[PDB]
């Protein structure tokens, strides 16, 4: 999946290795283009939210296994090299499964809608769905992208999708989508039971964020104000439908069917508004792509049907298929099945431990087996994920 075996120290070339700036709306940071539309920035995220530049534990911080702070993590070239190789490895592990091959393909196709214009006959890119790539002469060129993998902010283990918003549009819920920045680290993982003896395979963790990214890129994320009040056992706790859907499996039990019907109809109409916008367009801003090219890009993204006179429309069956793919097929639970790893069987459990790991060495973790290395003592019984048995690979954090 990933074009090249990048080393962090590889010389910049202004194409797939480059110093870049992120919308807001900072010094340039070294970034690597690991695939069409997908970049990796091996830096702590002090950028997507300028205020969050302090990496020290704040007053009243939580503790492991809820949060973990270390202002020094991912500061050196060696750890940045390891981060890049770690993330690369997880993409290949994900891509090596039919399911992950499909998700990644959906992500690459998921170009954020060009809804930047104020004139409704003009297609224009939204600037916050781009990065600025520095050139040899110190100038910058704007490049559109779908996905960025970036190191975590202050709380090292707070992985999540974030994206830049629009003054008025809800890009992640209006079918338009937006460039997704996934705060993530391959250098840590979490323990669960069944004490936290067993370690989550970091590939499932990344896939979980990629699923969120899929929703957000297709502008179909469920408003976080839609929640389920948790009543599985034991007062107060809520979980968003967006998270329940992302996990899938057992947790589909808690999604209000009547509500899901509302969402499905809502987004169908949103895709319809997109078709209409493409149909009204008479001009396009930019020197690179043609109006007809971009139209085609979004035809493919939303699986629109195109008639004799170039007019677009949404196909009910094709929408149903895509929407189902994005929301029902692409789930953490389904990934567990494809990876054949031990994992939580519900989203609704709290981690019991956090571990430092290193999946870069072939002897530790592989594309095909993760920690459960075939032809080793770690092959059977998820021994590889067993933090006591696979002692060399996990260091529990304080």
């Amino acid at each position: 999946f990933v074009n090249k075996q990048f080393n962090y120290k590889d010389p910049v070339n202004g194409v797939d290795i480059a110093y870049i700036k992120i919308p807001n709306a900072m010094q340039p940071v070294k970034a690597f283009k690991i695939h069409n539309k997908i970049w990796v920035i091996p830096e702590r995220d002090t950028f997507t939210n300028p205020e969050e530049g302090d990496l020290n534990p704040p007053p009243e911080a939580k503790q492991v296994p809820v949060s973990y702070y270390d202002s020094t993590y991912l500061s050196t070239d060696n750890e940045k090299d390891n981060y890049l190789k770690g993330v690369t490895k997880l993409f290949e592990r994900i891509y090596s499964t039919d399911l992950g091959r499909m998700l990644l393909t959906s992500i690459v196709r998921g170009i954020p809608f060009w809804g930047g214009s104020t004139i409704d006959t003009e297609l224009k890119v939204i600037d916050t769905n781009c990065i600025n790539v520095i050139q040899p002469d110190g100038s910058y060129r704007s490049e559109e992208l779908n996905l960025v993998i970036i190191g975590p902010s202050a709380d090292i283990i707070q992985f999540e999708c974030k994206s830049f918003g629009h003054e008025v549009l809800n890009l992640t819920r209006n079918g338009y989508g937006s460039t997704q920045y996934i705060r993530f680290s391959p250098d840590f993982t979490f323990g669960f039971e069944e004490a936290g003896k067993f370690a989550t395979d970091p590939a499932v963790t990344l896939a979980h964020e990629l699923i969120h990214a899929g929703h957000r890129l297709y502008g179909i994320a469920i408003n976080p104000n839609r929640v389920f009040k948790v009543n599985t056992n034991a007062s107060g706790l809520e979980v968003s439908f967006e998270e329940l859907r992302t996990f899938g499996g057992h947790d589909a039990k808690f999604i209000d069917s009547l509500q899901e019907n509302e969402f499905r109809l809502y987004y169908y109409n949103k895709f319809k508004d997109i078709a209409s916008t493409l149909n009204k367009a008479k001009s396009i801003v930019g020197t690179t792509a043609s109006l007809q090219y971009m139209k085609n890009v979004f035809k493919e993204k939303y699986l629109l049907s195109e008639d004799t006179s170039g007019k677009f429309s949404v196909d009910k069956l094709k929408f149903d298929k895509l929407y189902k793919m994005l929301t029902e097929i692409y789930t953490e639970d389904n990934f567990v099945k494809f990876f054949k790893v031990l994992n939580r069987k519900t989203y609704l459990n709290f981690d019991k431990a956090v571990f430092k790991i290193n999946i870069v060495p072939k002897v530790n973790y592989t594309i095909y087996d993760g920690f459960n290395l075939r032809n080793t003592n770690l092959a059977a019984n998820f021994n590889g994920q067993n933090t006591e048995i696979n002692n060399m690979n996990f260091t529990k954090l304080k």
Binding site: V66, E209, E243, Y347, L348, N349, F350
Partner: peptide
Amino acid sequence: XRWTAML
């Protein structure tokens, strides 16, 4: 995001 993050 994982559930534990809500804490």
